[PDB]
Amino acid sequence: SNRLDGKVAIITGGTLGIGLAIATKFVEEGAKVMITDRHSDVGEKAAKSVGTPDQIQFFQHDSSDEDGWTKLFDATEKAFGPVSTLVNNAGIAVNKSVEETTTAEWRKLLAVNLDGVFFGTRLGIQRMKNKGLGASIINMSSIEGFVGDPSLGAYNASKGAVRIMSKSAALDCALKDYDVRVNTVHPGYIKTPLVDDLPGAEEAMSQRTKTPMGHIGEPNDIAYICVYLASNESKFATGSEFVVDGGYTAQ
Amino acid sequence: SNRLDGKVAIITGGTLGIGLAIATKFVEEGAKVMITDRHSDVGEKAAKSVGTPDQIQFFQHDSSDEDGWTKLFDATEKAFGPVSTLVNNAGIAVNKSVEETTTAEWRKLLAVNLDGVFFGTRLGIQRMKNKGLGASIINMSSIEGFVGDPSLGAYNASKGAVRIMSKSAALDCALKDYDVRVNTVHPGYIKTPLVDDLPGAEEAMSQRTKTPMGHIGEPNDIAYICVYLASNESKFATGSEFVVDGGYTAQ
Amino acid sequence: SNRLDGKVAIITGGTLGIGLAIATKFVEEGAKVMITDRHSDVGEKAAKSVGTPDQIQFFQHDSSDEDGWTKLFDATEKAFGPVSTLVNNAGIAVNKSVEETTTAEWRKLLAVNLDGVFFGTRLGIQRMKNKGLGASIINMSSIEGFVGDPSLGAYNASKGAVRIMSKSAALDCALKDYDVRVNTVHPGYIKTPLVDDLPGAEEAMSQRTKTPMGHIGEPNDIAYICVYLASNESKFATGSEFVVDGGYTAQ
Amino acid sequence: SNRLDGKVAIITGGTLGIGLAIATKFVEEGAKVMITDRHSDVGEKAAKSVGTPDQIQFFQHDSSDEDGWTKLFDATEKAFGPVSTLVNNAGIAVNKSVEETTTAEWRKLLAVNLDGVFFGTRLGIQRMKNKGLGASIINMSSIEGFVGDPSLGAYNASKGAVRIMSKSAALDCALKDYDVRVNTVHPGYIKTPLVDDLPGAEEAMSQRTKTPMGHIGEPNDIAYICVYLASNESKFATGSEFVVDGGYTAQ
Ligand SMILES: NC(=O)c1ccc[n+]([C@@H]2O[C@H](COP(=O)([O-])OP(=O)(O)OC[C@H]3O[C@@H](n4cnc5c(N)ncnc54)[C@H](O)[C@@H]3O)[C@@H](O)[C@H]2O)c1
Ligand SMILES: NC(=O)c1ccc[n+]([C@@H]2O[C@H](COP(=O)([O-])OP(=O)(O)OC[C@H]3O[C@@H](n4cnc5c(N)ncnc54)[C@H](O)[C@@H]3O)[C@@H](O)[C@H]2O)c1
Ligand SMILES: NC(=O)c1ccc[n+]([C@@H]2O[C@H](COP(=O)([O-])OP(=O)(O)OC[C@H]3O[C@@H](n4cnc5c(N)ncnc54)[C@H](O)[C@@H]3O)[C@@H](O)[C@H]2O)c1
Ligand SMILES: NC(=O)c1ccc[n+]([C@@H]2O[C@H](COP(=O)([O-])OP(=O)(O)OC[C@H]3O[C@@H](n4cnc5c(N)ncnc54)[C@H](O)[C@@H]3O)[C@@H](O)[C@H]2O)c1
Ligand SMILES: C[C@@H](O)c1ccccc1
Ligand SMILES: C[C@@H](O)c1ccccc1
Ligand SMILES: C[C@@H](O)c1ccccc1
Ligand SMILES: C[C@@H](O)c1ccccc1
Ligand SMILES: [Mg+2]
Ligand SMILES: [Mg+2]
C-alpha cells in the first residue's frame, strides 16, 4: 500500500502478461498509469479490468513510432499530471538464429525492442528531468541481455543494447543531477496466456537445465521488482540490472 | 506494511548502520528479528531502540564463531518460532593492498566475511529447508564483489567468494525444492556514523569519479532491497546480485 | 611466426589504427588479408604499406552496406581462396548522451556498428560453416560494451548489442558443429593518430580514475589478442569477451 | 617461437594436466620454468619429460604452505635468475554442496585454492615489482568463478575470491607503476588423465546443456592463453578474466 503514492507511470505493452501485472500492482500502490499497445481492442479492455479512469487509462501506440511517443506523454500528463515513471516493456521476438535472421526481421525487431526503448528513454529524460518527481525509467532487458540463445539472435542484440544503453543514460542523469534513475529488469521465463499457447514451451522452460527452480515464474514476479524500482525506496539504485529468473543465469 | 508478515529473521551485525536499518524496516513490515553483534553493550541498546521483545531481540555472537551460530538459531526459534530469513551482514575491512596484507589480517577478515557467511548459509539451509516458510538467505556481498579496490585486497577476496558461493547454494536449494532462496546484495558507499568518523571519507566517496550521483547512500537504501528479497514478492529471484550503488559500478 | 598459416582474413576498417595493426600482425603470422574502408584513398595506401598483393589487398566497402558485404567475400575468395576469419572492426562514435542523440545520429551509428556487424557475422557463418577451416569471427565490442559512458549513448547501445549477439552466434555455431567460433574483443583507450588529433584526449584517457595503468594502449595491443583468437590456439574459446583495457573496467 | 624469451616462470601444480601443458608451451616459447607439486615422485618425472634443467626444474611445495612459497622463489632465482612470471594453478575440489560441506573440507580447500593464491600473488608482487621484467601473475579462476555449481560450493567460493582479489592486485600494481600485471584464466572442462578416471565425467561434461561445443577441451587450450598473458604481447591487459570454455558460460 501507498508505495507509489503520487507517481504517474507510462507502461508500454501494458495490456498483457508482464506489463499488465506491472500496471495492476502500480495502481494498487497508488500510481496513476497509462498503458499502451498497438491494438486498441486489447488495450481498452485491459485498462478497465484493472481500474477506473482516475487510476488507469489506455493509449494506442506502437513503441517503434517516434512521433507517437510525444503524443503518449502529452496524453498521460493531460490525464494525470507530469509523468514520473516510464516502464519500457513493449517487445517482440523472432525465433531465428543470427545466421537465419532476415534483414526485414532484424529491422522490425530492432525498431520495437531497441529504437522504441531509445525513443522512450530519451523523451523520458527530457520530460522528467529537474522536476523533483523522483523519476525512474525501468527498461526491460531480459535474461537474454546476459546470455545468448542460439535461436534468439536479433532478440539478444536488442537486449544487450538496452542493458548498456541504460547505464549510459543512468550515468548522465546522475552526473547532471536530473533526479532521473535508469535501471534494467531481466526476467527469466514467465508463464502467461501466450506461453500457454506455445505447445511444450512451459515444460521446456521448466527443465532443470534451463530454470533450476523447475518451474517458470508469474507476471507478478516482475511487477514487484518494478514497484521497488519505481518507488523512492530505490533512490540510490541507478545503472543496475535486476534479475528475476529462477536461477537461469546462475548456472 | 505487512510485507514480511509471519517471517522470523536473523540479521548478523544488526546493531549499527545498514544492519540496524534492515532490522528496523523488517519489524515495520511484520517480521520478528534477532540481531547480533559481538558487543553486548551495542546490541542490547540497539534492539530496544527498534521495538519491544515480541518484535526484536539481541543475541551476542561473533559470526566467525561456528558453534555460536547453532546457539543463535536455537535462541531465535525459542523466541519467535522457526527461522525463515537470514541476513549475513556482519563484516570487517582492512585497508591494505594484497601486497601489504599480513597473514593475520587475511585470516581474521576471512573468518568473519567468508567463513561466517559460509557457516550461516550452511546452517540456514539445514534449518530452513522443506518447511514451507518461503525461506530467504540474503548475503551482503558489496560493490567490491564486482570491482577491485587497490587498498581492499582481502575484502575483495571475501566479497567475490560470497558472490559466487551464494549462487552455488541458490542452485542446490532450487534443484532440491528446498523452499530456500539465496541472493546477494551489493551496496555502494553508505553514510553511517562510522563513515562520519573517517575524516574526508564521505567527500571522497561522493566525487563523481567514484559515485556518479555525487553523494553516498543511506542505511534505508539497503534495508528496502532486503525487504523485497526477504518477502515472498521475490519468490522467483534466486542466485542473483542486487546492486544499490549510486552508479558506482555502471562506469 | 606461422601462427595463422593458411588463414584468409577480412578485416573491416583495416586501413587505420587498430584495424591496420591487426592486418599487419595477421600478415606477419602467415594470413592472407583483405582490408576495407569506405575511402579508397586511405585503403589503397594502407595495403601497400603492409605487404604485397599475395599477402594483403584492399576492398572498398562501407560495413553498413548489406549488398557490398557479398561483393567483399567474393573478392577475398577470388584473391586468396575461401575466407576463414572475419574481424568486424569498422565502427563510428557520436559524442552525445542518450538525451541529446538525434534520431539521424542513432540510425547512422547503428547502421555501421550494429547492422554492419550483424551483416558480417551472418554472412561469415554462411560462408565459413562446415569447411574445416578453423573459422573465427572476431567482433570488436569495446569497454563500452561493459560499462556506460554518459556521452556515448548510441555507442554503448551498439557495443552491448554486439557483445550479446556474438554469444548467440557462438552458441548456434557450436551446437551445429559448424567449425566457426565467435568472440568479442573489448579495447580500452588506444593511442592512434586520430586520438592525437583530439586535443587533451590521451591525457584525459590516462588519468588514473580512467585507465589505472596511467597511460593508454597501442594498436598492437589489440592486434595480438586478435591473432590468438584467429588462430587454432583458441579452438576451445567461443562466446567469450576478451578485454585489453589497462585496468579500466577492473575498478 | 620466442614469445617468452627471457622470462622465468613458476607454475604451481605444474606436473600434470593443465599445469604441465602450460609448462611445456612456456619452455617451447623460451621461458625457464620451475614447476611444483607436493609429490616429489610426480614432479621429478614431470620436469624431465618436458626438457633439460637449463629449461625446467621441479620444486616440491604445497601451495598452502606459506613459508615454502619463499623457498620456492629463492630456488627459482638460484636456477634461472629473477622470476618474471607466476602461474597460480594448483587447486583442489570437493564435490559437496554448501549445505553438505564439512568445516574441515572448507578449510582444506580454501588453504590451497584461496590462501595459496594469496600467498603466491602477494610474494610475486613483492619479488617482481620494479625490475623491468614485464612481470605477469596469472591466476587460475575457473568457469566456477562466474557461475555456481550446486555440488562445488567451497570451490565456487574460492574461485570467486580469486577472480576479484586478482582485480585488486592488478589495480594496485598498475597505480603504483610496478610493472606487474595480474589476470585470471577461467577454463571450462578440460580432458586430462584424471577426468578419464572419473567414469562418465567427460560424457557428462560434453552434453550440449553443459558444453555447447559438444566436447571438452585439451590442456593446450589453457596453455596457449597463458602464453599470451605471460608474454609482453599482453602488456595492456590487467585486471581481466580470460575464459576458454567451449561456450559453457555463454548460455
Ligand atoms: N513472457 C516471457 O516468458 C518473457 C521471457 C523473457 C523476457 N520477456 C520480456 O518481457 C517483456 C514483457 O512481456 P509480456 O509478458 O508483457 O509479453 P507478452 O508475451 O505477454 O506479450 C507481448 C507484449 O508485448 C507488447 N508489444 C509487443 N509489440 C509491441 C509494439 N510494437 N508496441 C507496443 N507494445 C508491444 C504487447 O503489449 C504485449 O503485452 C517483453 O519485453 C519480453 O520481451 C518475456
Ligand atoms: N558502510 C558502508 O559504506 C559500506 C560500503 C560497502 C559495503 N558495506 C558492507 O555492508 C555491511 C553492513 O555495513 P554496516 O553499516 O552495518 O557496517 P558498519 O560500518 O556500520 O559497522 C560494522 C558492522 O559490522 C558488524 N560486525 C563486524 N564484525 C562483526 C563480527 N565479528 N560479528 C558480528 N558482527 C560484526 C557490526 O554489527 C557492525 O554493525 C558490511 O558487510 C559491510 O562490509 C558497507
Ligand atoms: N581508438 C580507440 O581509442 C578506441 C577505443 C575504444 C574502442 N575502439 C574501437 O576499436 C575499433 C577500431 O578502432 P580504430 O583504431 O581502427 O579506429 P580509428 O579511430 O583509428 O579509425 C576509425 C576506423 O573505423 C573504420 N570505419 C569507420 N566507419 C566505417 C565504415 N562505415 N565502413 C568501414 N570502416 C569504417 C575506419 O576504417 C577506421 O580505420 C572501432 O570499432 C572502435 O569503435 C577504439
Ligand atoms: N581439469 C579440468 O577439467 C578443470 C576444469 C575447471 C577448472 N580446472 C582448474 O584448472 C587448474 C589446473 O588443472 P589441472 O589439470 O592441472 O588439474 P588436475 O586435475 O589435472 O590435477 C590436479 C593438479 O593440481 C595440483 N595441486 C593440487 N593440490 C595441490 C597442492 N596442495 N599443492 C600444489 N599443487 C597442487 C597438482 O599439481 C595437479 O597437477 C586447477 O586449479 C583446477 O581447479 C580444471
Ligand atoms: C526469451 C523470450 O522472450 C522468448 C522469446 C521467443 C520465444 C519464447 C520466449
Ligand atoms: C568498501 C567499504 O566496506 C569500506 C571498506 C574500508 C574502508 C571504508 C569503506
Ligand atoms: C570509446 C571510444 O571509441 C571513443 C569514442 C568517442 C570519442 C573518443 C573515444
Ligand atoms: C570444476 C572442476 O574443477 C571439477 C571439480 C570437481 C569435479 C570435477 C571437475
Ligand atoms: Mg568501473
Ligand atoms: Mg549459464
Side-chain angles (χ1 to χ4, degrees):
Chain A
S1 55
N2 309 105
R3 293 169 63 205
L4 300 177
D5 273 357
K7 301 293 187 183
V8 173
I10 294 172
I11 303 167
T12 67
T15 62
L16 300 173
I18 288 165
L20 179 63
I22 301 165
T24 297
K25 297 301 183 179
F26 277 26
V27 169
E28 194 195 316
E29 294 297 331
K32 305 302 188 183
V33 175
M34 186 72 76
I35 59 177
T36 74
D37 200 274
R38 72 209 260 295
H39 290 301
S40 68
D41 55 279
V42 177
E44 289 196 304
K45 271 175 177 177
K48 173 58 189 312
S49 80
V50 173
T52 40
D54 63 339
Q55 302 181 318
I56 181 167
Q57 290 178 39
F58 169 70
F59 183 99
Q60 187 172 31
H61 170 65
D62 181 327
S63 59
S64 69
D65 170 9
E66 183 180 6
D67 189 52
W69 267 103
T70 304
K71 300 187 178 314
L72 167 59
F73 268 77
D74 287 339
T76 303
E77 174 177 26
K78 193 185 182 133
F80 301 132
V83 179
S84 63
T85 313
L86 173 61
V87 184
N88 280 303
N89 169 257
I92 62 172
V94 173
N95 306 300
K96 291 290 200 67
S97 65
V98 173
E99 171 182 53
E100 292 302 329
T101 297
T102 73
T103 301
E105 285 168 337
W106 174 257
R107 293 203 192 284
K108 177 183 171 181
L109 182 151
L110 290 186
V112 175
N113 293 14
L114 179 48
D115 298 347
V117 178
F118 166 64
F119 296 149
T121 300
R122 179 180 67 186
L123 179 58
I125 294 166
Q126 300 165 316
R127 291 279 167 128
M128 300 200 280
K129 63 178 181 173
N130 298 148
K131 286 173 176 169
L133 298 170
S136 184
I137 301 173
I138 302 165
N139 289 337
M140 220 43 83
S141 199
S142 194
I143 64 291
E144 303 303 328
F146 283 90
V147 292
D149 186 292
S151 296
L152 291 173
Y155 193 82
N156 280 138
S158 73
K159 296 303 184 180
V162 169
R163 178 183 171 194
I164 312 192
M165 182 190 75
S166 293
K167 296 179 182 282
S168 175
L171 289 168
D172 191 71
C173 289
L175 293 165
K176 294 184 169 192
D177 305 330
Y178 281 176
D179 187 40
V180 181
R181 297 175 297 104
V182 189
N183 293 284
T184 55
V185 172
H186 302 260
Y189 284 97
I190 307 300
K191 185 181 173 68
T192 66
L194 285 170
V195 163
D196 302 344
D197 287 333
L198 309 185
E202 173 173 5
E203 178 170 9
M205 297 166 172
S206 295
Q207 295 311 299
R208 300 298 184 151
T209 47
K210 294 307 214 135
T211 305
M213 284 192 181
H215 69 263
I216 66 176
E218 72 178 4
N220 284 338
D221 293 320
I222 308 310
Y224 288 123
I225 188 64
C226 292
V227 171
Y228 164 75
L229 291 172
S231 83
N232 301 153
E233 295 165 18
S234 64
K235 59 185 173 57
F236 195 58
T238 203
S240 296
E241 295 105 319
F242 293 82
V243 180
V244 183
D245 75 352
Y248 191 108
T249 61
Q251 59 182 16
Chain B
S1 55
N2 309 105
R3 293 169 63 205
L4 300 177
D5 273 357
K7 301 293 187 183
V8 173
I10 294 172
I11 303 167
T12 67
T15 62
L16 300 173
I18 288 165
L20 179 63
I22 301 165
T24 297
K25 297 301 183 179
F26 277 26
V27 169
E28 194 195 316
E29 294 297 331
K32 305 302 188 183
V33 175
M34 186 72 76
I35 59 177
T36 74
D37 200 274
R38 72 209 260 295
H39 290 301
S40 68
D41 55 279
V42 177
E44 289 196 304
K45 271 175 177 177
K48 173 58 189 312
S49 80
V50 173
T52 40
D54 63 339
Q55 302 181 318
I56 181 167
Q57 290 178 39
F58 169 70
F59 183 99
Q60 187 172 31
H61 170 65
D62 181 327
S63 59
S64 69
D65 170 9
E66 183 180 6
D67 189 52
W69 267 103
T70 304
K71 300 187 178 314
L72 167 59
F73 268 77
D74 287 339
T76 303
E77 174 177 26
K78 193 185 182 133
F80 301 132
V83 179
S84 63
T85 313
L86 173 61
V87 184
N88 280 303
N89 169 257
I92 62 172
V94 173
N95 306 300
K96 291 290 200 67
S97 65
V98 173
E99 171 182 53
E100 292 302 329
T101 297
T102 73
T103 301
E105 285 168 337
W106 174 257
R107 293 203 192 284
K108 177 183 171 181
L109 182 151
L110 290 186
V112 175
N113 293 14
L114 179 48
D115 298 347
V117 178
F118 166 64
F119 296 149
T121 300
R122 179 180 67 186
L123 179 58
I125 294 166
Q126 300 165 316
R127 291 279 167 128
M128 300 200 280
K129 63 178 181 173
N130 298 148
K131 286 173 176 169
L133 298 170
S136 184
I137 301 173
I138 302 165
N139 289 337
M140 220 43 83
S141 199
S142 194
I143 64 291
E144 303 303 328
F146 283 90
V147 292
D149 186 292
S151 296
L152 291 173
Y155 193 82
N156 280 138
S158 73
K159 296 303 184 180
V162 169
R163 178 183 171 194
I164 312 192
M165 182 190 75
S166 293
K167 296 179 182 282
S168 175
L171 289 168
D172 191 71
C173 289
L175 293 165
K176 294 184 169 192
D177 305 330
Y178 281 176
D179 187 40
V180 181
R181 297 175 297 104
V182 189
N183 293 284
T184 55
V185 172
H186 302 260
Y189 284 97
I190 307 300
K191 185 181 173 68
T192 66
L194 285 170
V195 163
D196 302 344
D197 287 333
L198 309 185
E202 173 173 5
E203 178 170 9
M205 297 166 172
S206 295
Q207 295 311 299
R208 300 298 184 151
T209 47
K210 294 307 214 135
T211 305
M213 284 192 181
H215 69 263
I216 66 176
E218 72 178 4
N220 284 338
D221 293 320
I222 308 310
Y224 288 123
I225 188 64
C226 292
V227 171
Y228 164 75
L229 291 172
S231 83
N232 301 153
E233 295 165 18
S234 64
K235 59 185 173 57
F236 195 58
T238 203
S240 296
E241 295 105 319
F242 293 82
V243 180
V244 183
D245 75 352
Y248 191 108
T249 61
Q251 59 182 16
Chain C
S1 55
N2 309 105
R3 293 169 63 205
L4 300 177
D5 273 357
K7 301 293 187 183
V8 173
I10 294 172
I11 303 167
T12 67
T15 62
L16 300 173
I18 288 165
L20 179 63
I22 301 165
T24 297
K25 297 301 183 179
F26 277 26
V27 169
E28 194 195 316
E29 294 297 331
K32 305 302 188 183
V33 175
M34 186 72 76
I35 59 177
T36 74
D37 200 274
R38 72 209 260 295
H39 290 301
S40 68
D41 55 279
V42 177
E44 289 196 304
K45 271 175 177 177
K48 173 58 189 312
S49 80
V50 173
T52 40
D54 63 339
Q55 302 181 318
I56 181 167
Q57 290 178 39
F58 169 70
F59 183 99
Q60 187 172 31
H61 170 65
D62 181 327
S63 59
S64 69
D65 170 9
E66 183 180 6
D67 189 52
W69 267 103
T70 304
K71 300 187 178 314
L72 167 59
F73 268 77
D74 287 339
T76 303
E77 174 177 26
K78 193 185 182 133
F80 301 132
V83 179
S84 63
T85 313
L86 173 61
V87 184
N88 280 303
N89 169 257
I92 62 172
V94 173
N95 306 300
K96 291 290 200 67
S97 65
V98 173
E99 171 182 53
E100 292 302 329
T101 297
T102 73
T103 301
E105 285 168 337
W106 174 257
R107 293 203 192 284
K108 177 183 171 181
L109 182 151
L110 290 186
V112 175
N113 293 14
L114 179 48
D115 298 347
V117 178
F118 166 64
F119 296 149
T121 300
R122 179 180 67 186
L123 179 58
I125 294 166
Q126 300 165 316
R127 291 279 167 128
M128 300 200 280
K129 63 178 181 173
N130 298 148
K131 286 173 176 169
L133 298 170
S136 184
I137 301 173
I138 302 165
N139 289 337
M140 220 43 83
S141 199
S142 194
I143 64 291
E144 303 303 328
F146 283 90
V147 292
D149 186 292
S151 296
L152 291 173
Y155 193 82
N156 280 138
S158 73
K159 296 303 184 180
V162 169
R163 178 183 171 194
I164 312 192
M165 182 190 75
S166 293
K167 296 179 182 282
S168 175
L171 289 168
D172 191 71
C173 289
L175 293 165
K176 294 184 169 192
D177 305 330
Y178 281 176
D179 187 40
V180 181
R181 297 175 297 104
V182 189
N183 293 284
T184 55
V185 172
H186 302 260
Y189 284 97
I190 307 300
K191 185 181 173 68
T192 66
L194 285 170
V195 163
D196 302 344
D197 287 333
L198 309 185
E202 173 173 5
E203 178 170 9
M205 297 166 172
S206 295
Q207 295 311 299
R208 300 298 184 151
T209 47
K210 294 307 214 135
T211 305
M213 284 192 181
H215 69 263
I216 66 176
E218 72 178 4
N220 284 338
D221 293 320
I222 308 310
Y224 288 123
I225 188 64
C226 292
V227 171
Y228 164 75
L229 291 172
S231 83
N232 301 153
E233 295 165 18
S234 64
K235 59 185 173 57
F236 195 58
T238 203
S240 296
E241 295 105 319
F242 293 82
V243 180
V244 183
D245 75 352
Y248 191 108
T249 61
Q251 59 182 16
Chain D
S1 55
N2 309 105
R3 293 169 63 205
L4 300 177
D5 273 357
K7 301 293 187 183
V8 173
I10 294 172
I11 303 167
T12 67
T15 62
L16 300 173
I18 288 165
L20 179 63
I22 301 165
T24 297
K25 297 301 183 179
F26 277 26
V27 169
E28 194 195 316
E29 294 297 331
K32 305 302 188 183
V33 175
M34 186 72 76
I35 59 177
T36 74
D37 200 274
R38 72 209 260 295
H39 290 301
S40 68
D41 55 279
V42 177
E44 289 196 304
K45 271 175 177 177
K48 173 58 189 312
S49 80
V50 173
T52 40
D54 63 339
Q55 302 181 318
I56 181 167
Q57 290 178 39
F58 169 70
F59 183 99
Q60 187 172 31
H61 170 65
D62 181 327
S63 59
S64 69
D65 170 9
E66 183 180 6
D67 189 52
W69 267 103
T70 304
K71 300 187 178 314
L72 167 59
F73 268 77
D74 287 339
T76 303
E77 174 177 26
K78 193 185 182 133
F80 301 132
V83 179
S84 63
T85 313
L86 173 61
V87 184
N88 280 303
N89 169 257
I92 62 172
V94 173
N95 306 300
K96 291 290 200 67
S97 65
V98 173
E99 171 182 53
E100 292 302 329
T101 297
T102 73
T103 301
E105 285 168 337
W106 174 257
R107 293 203 192 284
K108 177 183 171 181
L109 182 151
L110 290 186
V112 175
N113 293 14
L114 179 48
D115 298 347
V117 178
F118 166 64
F119 296 149
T121 300
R122 179 180 67 186
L123 179 58
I125 294 166
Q126 300 165 316
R127 291 279 167 128
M128 300 200 280
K129 63 178 181 173
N130 298 148
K131 286 173 176 169
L133 298 170
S136 184
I137 301 173
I138 302 165
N139 289 337
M140 220 43 83
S141 199
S142 194
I143 64 291
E144 303 303 328
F146 283 90
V147 292
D149 186 292
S151 296
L152 291 173
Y155 193 82
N156 280 138
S158 73
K159 296 303 184 180
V162 169
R163 178 183 171 194
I164 312 192
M165 182 190 75
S166 293
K167 296 179 182 282
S168 175
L171 289 168
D172 191 71
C173 289
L175 293 165
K176 294 184 169 192
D177 305 330
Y178 281 176
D179 187 40
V180 181
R181 297 175 297 104
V182 189
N183 293 284
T184 55
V185 172
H186 302 260
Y189 284 97
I190 307 300
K191 185 181 173 68
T192 66
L194 285 170
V195 163
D196 302 344
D197 287 333
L198 309 185
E202 173 173 5
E203 178 170 9
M205 297 166 172
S206 295
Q207 295 311 299
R208 300 298 184 151
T209 47
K210 294 307 214 135
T211 305
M213 284 192 181
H215 69 263
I216 66 176
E218 72 178 4
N220 284 338
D221 293 320
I222 308 310
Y224 288 123
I225 188 64
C226 292
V227 171
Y228 164 75
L229 291 172
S231 83
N232 301 153
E233 295 165 18
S234 64
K235 59 185 173 57
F236 195 58
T238 203
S240 296
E241 295 105 319
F242 293 82
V243 180
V244 183
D245 75 352
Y248 191 108
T249 61
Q251 59 182 16

Coordinates of all heavy atoms in Angstrom, one line a residue, chain C residues 84-105:
Chain C
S84 N 38.5 -17.7 -44.0 CA 38.4 -18.5 -42.7 C 38.2 -17.6 -41.5 O 37.8 -18.1 -40.4 CB 39.8 -19.2 -42.4 OG 40.9 -18.3 -42.3
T85 N 38.4 -16.2 -41.6 CA 38.5 -15.4 -40.5 C 37.9 -14.0 -40.8 O 38.2 -13.5 -41.9 CB 40.0 -15.2 -40.1 OG1 40.7 -16.5 -40.1 CG2 40.2 -14.5 -38.8
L86 N 37.0 -13.5 -39.9 CA 36.4 -12.2 -40.1 C 36.6 -11.4 -38.9 O 36.3 -11.8 -37.8 CB 34.9 -12.3 -40.4 CG 34.2 -11.0 -40.5 CD1 34.7 -10.1 -41.6 CD2 32.7 -11.3 -40.7
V87 N 37.2 -10.2 -39.0 CA 37.3 -9.2 -37.9 C 36.4 -8.1 -38.2 O 36.6 -7.3 -39.1 CB 38.7 -8.8 -37.7 CG1 38.8 -7.9 -36.5 CG2 39.7 -9.9 -37.5
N88 N 35.3 -8.0 -37.5 CA 34.3 -6.9 -37.6 C 34.8 -5.7 -36.8 O 34.5 -5.6 -35.6 CB 32.9 -7.3 -37.2 CG 32.2 -8.0 -38.3 OD1 32.0 -7.5 -39.4 ND2 31.7 -9.2 -38.0
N89 N 35.7 -4.9 -37.3 CA 36.3 -3.8 -36.6 C 35.8 -2.4 -37.0 O 36.0 -1.5 -36.2 CB 37.8 -3.9 -36.8 CG 38.6 -2.7 -36.4 OD1 39.0 -1.9 -37.3 ND2 38.8 -2.6 -35.2
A90 N 35.2 -2.2 -38.1 CA 34.7 -0.9 -38.5 C 33.7 -0.4 -37.5 O 32.8 -1.1 -37.1 CB 34.1 -1.0 -39.9
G91 N 33.8 0.9 -37.2 CA 32.9 1.5 -36.2 C 33.0 3.0 -36.2 O 34.1 3.5 -36.6
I92 N 32.0 3.7 -35.7 CA 32.0 5.1 -35.5 C 31.4 5.4 -34.2 O 30.8 4.6 -33.5 CB 31.2 5.8 -36.6 CG1 29.7 5.4 -36.6 CG2 31.8 5.6 -38.0 CD1 28.8 6.3 -37.5
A93 N 31.7 6.6 -33.7 CA 31.2 7.1 -32.5 C 30.5 8.5 -32.7 O 30.8 9.2 -33.6 CB 32.3 7.3 -31.5
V94 N 29.6 8.7 -31.8 CA 29.0 10.0 -31.6 C 29.2 10.4 -30.2 O 29.0 9.6 -29.3 CB 27.5 9.9 -32.0 CG1 26.7 11.1 -31.7 CG2 27.4 9.5 -33.5
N95 N 29.6 11.7 -29.9 CA 29.8 12.1 -28.6 C 28.5 12.8 -28.1 O 28.5 14.1 -27.9 CB 31.0 13.0 -28.6 CG 32.2 12.3 -29.2 OD1 32.6 11.2 -28.7 ND2 32.7 12.8 -30.3
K96 N 27.4 12.1 -28.0 CA 26.2 12.6 -27.5 C 25.7 11.7 -26.3 O 25.9 10.4 -26.4 CB 25.1 12.5 -28.5 CG 25.2 13.5 -29.7 CD 25.0 15.0 -29.3 CE 24.8 15.9 -30.4 NZ 23.4 15.6 -31.1
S97 N 25.1 12.2 -25.3 CA 24.3 11.5 -24.3 C 23.1 10.9 -25.0 O 22.7 11.4 -26.1 CB 23.9 12.4 -23.2 OG 23.0 13.4 -23.8
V98 N 22.5 9.9 -24.4 CA 21.2 9.4 -24.9 C 20.2 10.5 -25.1 O 19.6 10.7 -26.2 CB 20.6 8.3 -24.0 CG1 19.2 7.9 -24.4 CG2 21.5 7.1 -23.9
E99 N 20.1 11.4 -24.1 CA 19.2 12.5 -24.1 C 19.4 13.4 -25.4 O 18.4 13.8 -25.9 CB 19.3 13.4 -22.9 CG 18.6 14.7 -22.9 CD 18.7 15.6 -21.7 OE1 19.9 15.8 -21.3 OE2 17.7 16.0 -21.1
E100 N 20.6 13.6 -25.8 CA 21.0 14.6 -26.8 C 21.3 13.9 -28.2 O 21.8 14.5 -29.1 CB 22.1 15.4 -26.4 CG 21.7 16.4 -25.2 CD 20.6 17.3 -25.6 OE1 20.4 17.7 -26.8 OE2 19.7 17.6 -24.7
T101 N 21.0 12.6 -28.3 CA 21.2 11.9 -29.5 C 20.1 12.2 -30.5 O 18.9 11.9 -30.1 CB 21.3 10.4 -29.3 OG1 22.5 10.2 -28.5 CG2 21.6 9.6 -30.6
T102 N 20.4 12.7 -31.7 CA 19.3 12.8 -32.7 C 19.0 11.5 -33.3 O 19.8 10.5 -33.3 CB 19.7 13.8 -33.8 OG1 20.7 13.2 -34.6 CG2 20.2 15.1 -33.2
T103 N 17.8 11.3 -33.8 CA 17.4 10.1 -34.5 C 18.3 9.8 -35.7 O 18.7 8.6 -35.9 CB 16.0 10.1 -34.8 OG1 15.3 10.3 -33.6 CG2 15.5 8.7 -35.5
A104 N 18.7 10.8 -36.4 CA 19.6 10.6 -37.5 C 21.0 10.0 -37.0 O 21.6 9.1 -37.6 CB 19.8 11.8 -38.3
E105 N 21.5 10.6 -35.9 CA 22.8 10.1 -35.3 C 22.6 8.6 -34.9 O 23.5 7.8 -35.1 CB 23.2 10.9 -34.1 CG 23.7 12.3 -34.5 CD 23.9 13.2 -33.3 OE1 23.2 13.1 -32.3 OE2 24.6 14.2 -33.4

